[PDB]
CSV table of N, CA and C in Angstrom, one decimal:
chain,number,residue,atom,x,y,z
I,1032,UNK,N,124.9,126.1,88.8
I,1032,UNK,CA,124.2,126.1,87.8
I,1032,UNK,C,123.5,124.7,87.1
I,1033,UNK,N,124.1,124.1,87.2
I,1033,UNK,CA,124.4,122.0,86.7
I,1033,UNK,C,123.3,121.2,87.5
I,1034,UNK,N,123.4,121.5,88.6
I,1034,UNK,CA,122.6,120.5,89.5
I,1034,UNK,C,121.3,121.4,89.5
I,1035,UNK,N,120.7,122.2,89.5
I,1035,UNK,CA,119.5,122.7,89.3
I,1035,UNK,C,118.9,122.5,87.6
I,1036,UNK,N,119.9,122.0,87.0
I,1036,UNK,CA,119.1,121.5,85.6
I,1036,UNK,C,119.2,119.9,85.7
I,1037,UNK,N,120.3,119.5,86.3
I,1037,UNK,CA,119.8,117.9,86.8
I,1037,UNK,C,118.5,117.8,87.5
I,1038,UNK,N,118.2,118.6,88.3
I,1038,UNK,CA,117.0,118.5,89.2
I,1038,UNK,C,115.8,118.7,88.3
I,1039,UNK,N,116.1,119.7,87.3
I,1039,UNK,CA,115.2,119.5,86.4
I,1039,UNK,C,114.5,118.5,85.3
I,1040,UNK,N,115.8,117.8,85.1
I,1040,UNK,CA,115.3,116.3,84.4
I,1040,UNK,C,114.7,115.9,85.4
I,1041,UNK,N,115.1,115.6,86.9
I,1041,UNK,CA,114.8,115.3,87.6
I,1041,UNK,C,113.2,115.1,88.3
I,1042,UNK,N,112.7,116.1,88.2
I,1042,UNK,CA,111.4,116.5,88.4
I,1042,UNK,C,110.3,116.5,87.6
I,1043,UNK,N,110.7,116.8,86.0
I,1043,UNK,CA,109.9,116.7,84.8
I,1043,UNK,C,109.7,115.2,84.9
I,1044,UNK,N,110.4,114.3,85.1
I,1044,UNK,CA,110.5,112.5,85.1
I,1044,UNK,C,109.3,112.5,86.2
I,1045,UNK,N,109.2,112.7,87.3
I,1045,UNK,CA,108.4,112.1,88.5
I,1045,UNK,C,107.1,113.2,88.2
I,1046,UNK,N,106.6,114.5,87.9
I,1046,UNK,CA,105.4,115.2,87.8
I,1046,UNK,C,104.6,113.8,86.5
I,1047,UNK,N,105.3,113.3,85.7
I,1047,UNK,CA,104.9,112.8,84.7
I,1047,UNK,C,104.7,111.5,85.2
I,1048,UNK,N,105.3,111.2,86.2
I,1048,UNK,CA,104.9,109.8,86.6
I,1048,UNK,C,103.5,109.7,87.8
I,1049,UNK,N,103.8,110.7,88.4
I,1049,UNK,CA,102.4,111.3,89.3
I,1049,UNK,C,101.3,111.4,88.0
I,1050,UNK,N,101.4,111.9,86.9
I,1050,UNK,CA,100.2,111.9,85.8
I,1050,UNK,C,100.3,110.5,84.8
I,1051,UNK,N,101.1,109.5,85.7
I,1051,UNK,CA,100.3,108.4,84.9
I,1051,UNK,C,99.9,107.2,86.2
I,1052,UNK,N,100.4,107.2,87.3
I,1052,UNK,CA,100.3,107.0,88.4
I,1052,UNK,C,99.1,107.0,89.1
I,1053,UNK,N,98.2,108.6,88.9
I,1053,UNK,CA,97.3,109.0,89.4
I,1053,UNK,C,96.2,108.7,88.4
I,1054,UNK,N,96.6,108.4,87.0
I,1054,UNK,CA,95.8,108.0,86.0
I,1054,UNK,C,95.0,106.5,86.2
I,1055,UNK,N,96.4,105.6,86.6
I,1055,UNK,CA,96.3,104.3,86.8
I,1055,UNK,C,95.3,104.4,88.2
I,1056,UNK,N,95.4,105.2,89.4
I,1056,UNK,CA,94.6,105.4,90.1
I,1056,UNK,C,92.9,105.5,90.0
I,1057,UNK,N,93.1,106.4,89.2
I,1057,UNK,CA,91.1,106.8,88.4
I,1057,UNK,C,91.2,105.4,87.7
I,1058,UNK,N,91.9,105.1,87.0
I,1058,UNK,CA,91.1,103.9,85.6
I,1058,UNK,C,91.1,102.7,86.8
I,1059,UNK,N,92.0,102.2,87.9
I,1059,UNK,CA,91.4,101.4,88.7
I,1059,UNK,C,90.1,101.7,89.7
I,1060,UNK,N,89.6,103.1,89.4
I,1060,UNK,CA,88.5,103.9,90.2
I,1060,UNK,C,87.2,103.5,90.1
I,1061,UNK,N,87.3,103.5,88.8
I,1061,UNK,CA,86.0,102.8,88.3
I,1061,UNK,C,85.7,101.3,88.0
I,1062,UNK,N,86.8,100.7,88.3
I,1062,UNK,CA,87.0,99.4,88.2
I,1062,UNK,C,86.3,98.7,89.4
I,1063,UNK,N,86.6,100.1,90.5
I,1063,UNK,CA,86.3,99.7,91.9
I,1063,UNK,C,84.7,100.0,92.2
I,1064,UNK,N,84.1,100.9,91.4
I,1064,UNK,CA,82.9,101.3,91.7
I,1064,UNK,C,82.0,100.4,90.6
I,1065,UNK,N,82.8,99.9,89.4
I,1065,UNK,CA,81.9,99.0,88.7
I,1065,UNK,C,81.8,97.5,89.6
I,1066,UNK,N,82.7,97.6,90.2
I,1066,UNK,CA,82.7,95.9,91.0
I,1066,UNK,C,81.8,95.9,92.0
I,1067,UNK,N,81.6,97.2,92.8
I,1067,UNK,CA,80.8,97.6,93.8
I,1067,UNK,C,79.1,97.1,93.8
I,1068,UNK,N,78.5,97.4,92.8
I,1068,UNK,CA,77.7,96.8,92.6
I,1068,UNK,C,77.1,95.8,91.4
I,1069,UNK,N,78.5,95.2,91.3
I,1069,UNK,CA,78.3,93.9,90.8
I,1069,UNK,C,78.3,92.8,91.6
I,1070,UNK,N,78.6,92.9,93.0
I,1070,UNK,CA,78.5,91.8,94.0
I,1070,UNK,C,77.3,92.2,94.9
I,1071,UNK,N,76.8,93.5,94.7
I,1071,UNK,CA,75.4,93.5,95.4
I,1071,UNK,C,74.2,92.9,94.5
I,1072,UNK,N,74.1,92.7,93.2
I,1072,UNK,CA,73.5,92.1,92.7
I,1072,UNK,C,73.3,90.5,92.4
I,1073,UNK,N,75.0,89.9,92.5
I,1073,UNK,CA,75.0,88.6,92.8
I,1073,UNK,C,74.6,88.6,94.5
I,1074,UNK,N,74.8,89.1,95.4
I,1074,UNK,CA,74.6,88.9,96.7
I,1074,UNK,C,73.2,88.6,97.0
I,1075,UNK,N,72.3,89.7,96.3
I,1075,UNK,CA,70.5,89.7,95.8
I,1075,UNK,C,70.1,88.4,94.9
I,1076,UNK,N,71.4,88.0,94.2
I,1076,UNK,CA,71.0,87.0,93.2
I,1076,UNK,C,70.3,85.5,93.8
I,1077,UNK,N,71.5,85.0,94.7
I,1077,UNK,CA,71.5,83.9,95.4
I,1077,UNK,C,70.2,83.6,96.5
I,1078,UNK,N,69.6,84.8,96.8
I,1078,UNK,CA,68.8,84.9,97.8
I,1078,UNK,C,67.5,84.1,97.2
I,1079,UNK,N,67.0,84.6,96.0
I,1079,UNK,CA,65.8,84.4,95.6
I,1079,UNK,C,65.8,82.8,95.2
I,1080,UNK,N,66.9,82.4,94.9
I,1080,UNK,CA,66.5,81.2,94.6
I,1080,UNK,C,66.5,79.7,95.3
M,1032,UNK,N,120.5,131.1,94.0
M,1032,UNK,CA,120.7,130.1,95.2
M,1032,UNK,C,119.2,130.4,96.1
M,1033,UNK,N,118.7,131.3,95.7
M,1033,UNK,CA,117.0,131.3,96.4
M,1033,UNK,C,116.2,130.0,95.8
M,1034,UNK,N,116.0,130.0,94.5
M,1034,UNK,CA,115.1,129.0,93.6
M,1034,UNK,C,115.6,127.5,93.5
M,1035,UNK,N,116.4,127.3,94.0
M,1035,UNK,CA,117.1,125.8,94.3
M,1035,UNK,C,116.5,125.3,95.5
M,1036,UNK,N,116.6,125.9,96.5
M,1036,UNK,CA,115.9,126.1,97.9
M,1036,UNK,C,114.5,125.8,97.8
M,1037,UNK,N,113.5,126.8,96.8
M,1037,UNK,CA,112.3,126.7,96.5
M,1037,UNK,C,112.0,125.6,96.1
M,1038,UNK,N,112.6,125.0,94.9
M,1038,UNK,CA,112.5,123.7,94.4
M,1038,UNK,C,112.7,122.5,95.7
M,1039,UNK,N,114.0,122.7,96.4
M,1039,UNK,CA,113.9,121.7,97.4
M,1039,UNK,C,112.8,121.3,97.8
M,1040,UNK,N,112.1,122.6,98.5
M,1040,UNK,CA,110.7,122.4,98.9
M,1040,UNK,C,109.5,121.6,98.3
M,1041,UNK,N,109.6,122.1,97.1
M,1041,UNK,CA,109.2,121.5,96.0
M,1041,UNK,C,109.1,120.0,95.9
M,1042,UNK,N,110.2,119.5,95.7
M,1042,UNK,CA,110.4,118.0,95.3
M,1042,UNK,C,110.5,117.0,96.4
M,1043,UNK,N,111.0,117.3,97.7
M,1043,UNK,CA,110.6,116.7,99.2
M,1043,UNK,C,109.0,116.6,99.2
M,1044,UNK,N,108.1,117.8,99.1
M,1044,UNK,CA,106.9,117.5,99.0
M,1044,UNK,C,106.4,116.4,98.1
M,1045,UNK,N,106.8,116.6,96.8
M,1045,UNK,CA,106.6,115.7,95.2
M,1045,UNK,C,106.6,114.3,95.6
M,1046,UNK,N,107.9,113.9,96.2
M,1046,UNK,CA,108.2,112.4,96.7
M,1046,UNK,C,107.7,111.8,97.7
M,1047,UNK,N,107.1,112.7,99.0
M,1047,UNK,CA,106.3,112.2,99.8
M,1047,UNK,C,104.9,112.0,99.0
M,1048,UNK,N,104.6,112.8,98.4
M,1048,UNK,CA,102.9,112.8,97.8
M,1048,UNK,C,102.9,111.1,96.9
M,1049,UNK,N,104.2,111.0,96.0
M,1049,UNK,CA,104.1,110.0,95.5
M,1049,UNK,C,104.3,108.7,96.4
M,1050,UNK,N,104.9,108.8,97.3
M,1050,UNK,CA,105.2,107.6,98.6
M,1050,UNK,C,103.9,107.7,99.5
M,1051,UNK,N,103.0,108.7,99.6
M,1051,UNK,CA,101.3,108.5,100.1
M,1051,UNK,C,100.6,107.9,99.3
M,1052,UNK,N,100.8,108.2,97.7
M,1052,UNK,CA,100.0,107.5,96.7
M,1052,UNK,C,100.3,105.8,96.7
M,1053,UNK,N,101.5,105.6,96.4
M,1053,UNK,CA,102.2,104.3,95.9
M,1053,UNK,C,101.6,103.2,97.5
M,1054,UNK,N,101.1,104.1,98.8
M,1054,UNK,CA,100.8,102.9,99.7
M,1054,UNK,C,99.5,103.0,99.6
M,1055,UNK,N,98.6,104.2,99.3
M,1055,UNK,CA,97.2,103.8,98.6
M,1055,UNK,C,97.1,103.2,97.6
M,1056,UNK,N,97.9,103.1,96.6
M,1056,UNK,CA,97.8,102.5,95.1
M,1056,UNK,C,97.7,101.0,95.7
M,1057,UNK,N,98.8,100.5,96.4
M,1057,UNK,CA,99.0,99.0,97.4
M,1057,UNK,C,97.6,98.8,98.1
M,1058,UNK,N,97.1,99.6,99.0
M,1058,UNK,CA,95.9,99.4,99.4
M,1058,UNK,C,95.1,98.9,98.9
M,1059,UNK,N,94.6,99.7,97.9
M,1059,UNK,CA,93.8,99.4,96.8
M,1059,UNK,C,94.4,98.1,95.7
M,1060,UNK,N,95.6,97.8,95.7
M,1060,UNK,CA,95.7,96.6,94.7
M,1060,UNK,C,95.7,95.2,95.5
M,1061,UNK,N,95.9,95.2,97.1
M,1061,UNK,CA,95.5,93.9,97.4
M,1061,UNK,C,94.1,93.7,98.1
M,1062,UNK,N,93.3,94.7,97.9
M,1062,UNK,CA,91.5,94.0,97.6
M,1062,UNK,C,91.2,94.1,96.1
M,1063,UNK,N,92.2,94.6,95.3
M,1063,UNK,CA,91.8,93.6,93.8
M,1063,UNK,C,92.0,92.4,93.7
M,1064,UNK,N,93.0,91.8,94.7
M,1064,UNK,CA,93.1,90.6,95.1
M,1064,UNK,C,92.2,89.7,95.9
M,1065,UNK,N,91.4,90.3,96.5
M,1065,UNK,CA,90.3,89.8,97.6
M,1065,UNK,C,89.0,90.1,96.8
M,1066,UNK,N,88.8,90.7,96.0
M,1066,UNK,CA,87.4,90.5,95.4
M,1066,UNK,C,87.4,89.8,93.6
M,1067,UNK,N,88.9,89.7,93.8
M,1067,UNK,CA,88.9,88.6,92.7
M,1067,UNK,C,88.5,87.2,92.7
M,1068,UNK,N,89.0,86.7,94.3
M,1068,UNK,CA,88.0,85.8,94.6
M,1068,UNK,C,87.1,85.3,95.0
M,1069,UNK,N,86.0,86.8,95.5
M,1069,UNK,CA,84.9,87.3,96.0
M,1069,UNK,C,84.1,86.8,94.7
M,1070,UNK,N,84.2,87.5,93.8
M,1070,UNK,CA,83.3,87.2,92.6
M,1070,UNK,C,83.5,85.6,92.0
M,1071,UNK,N,84.7,85.2,92.2
M,1071,UNK,CA,84.7,83.7,91.6
M,1071,UNK,C,83.7,82.7,92.6
M,1072,UNK,N,83.4,82.6,93.7
M,1072,UNK,CA,83.3,81.5,94.3
M,1072,UNK,C,81.6,81.7,94.7
M,1073,UNK,N,81.0,82.4,94.4
M,1073,UNK,CA,79.8,83.1,94.2
M,1073,UNK,C,79.3,82.5,92.8
M,1074,UNK,N,79.8,82.5,91.7
M,1074,UNK,CA,79.6,81.9,90.4
M,1074,UNK,C,79.2,80.2,90.4
M,1075,UNK,N,80.2,79.3,91.1
M,1075,UNK,CA,80.5,78.0,91.5
M,1075,UNK,C,79.1,78.5,92.5
M,1076,UNK,N,78.8,79.0,93.3
M,1076,UNK,CA,77.5,78.8,94.1
M,1076,UNK,C,76.4,78.8,93.6
M,1077,UNK,N,75.8,79.7,93.0
M,1077,UNK,CA,74.5,79.7,92.3
M,1077,UNK,C,74.0,78.9,91.2
M,1078,UNK,N,75.1,78.3,90.8
M,1078,UNK,CA,75.2,77.2,89.7
M,1078,UNK,C,74.6,76.0,90.5
M,1079,UNK,N,75.1,75.8,92.0
M,1079,UNK,CA,74.9,74.8,92.2
M,1079,UNK,C,73.7,74.3,92.7
M,1080,UNK,N,72.9,75.5,93.2
M,1080,UNK,CA,71.5,75.4,94.0
M,1080,UNK,C,70.3,75.6,92.8
C-alpha cells in the first residue's frame, strides 16, 4: 500500500510535466508557423530588387 | 495487487510518450537554431542591393 502512493506522487508529477512540455510544443508550433510565412515573403522580397 | 500492475502499464507508456516527445522537441529545437541564422543573413543581403 505504500509504493502505489509513491507511484501516485510519481505519475502526478509527470502528467503535469507532459502538460507543460506539450504546452511548450504548442507554443513553439505557432512560432514555426509564423516563421514559415516570414521566410516566404523575404525570398520574394530580394527577387524584385 | 491488480491495479498497480495496470498502473505499471500506464507509467511505461507515459515515460515512452515523454521520451518520444523529448526527441521530437529536440528535433524541432535544432531547426530553431538553423532558421535563426536563415532570417539573419538575408537582412544583410537585401540591405546591400
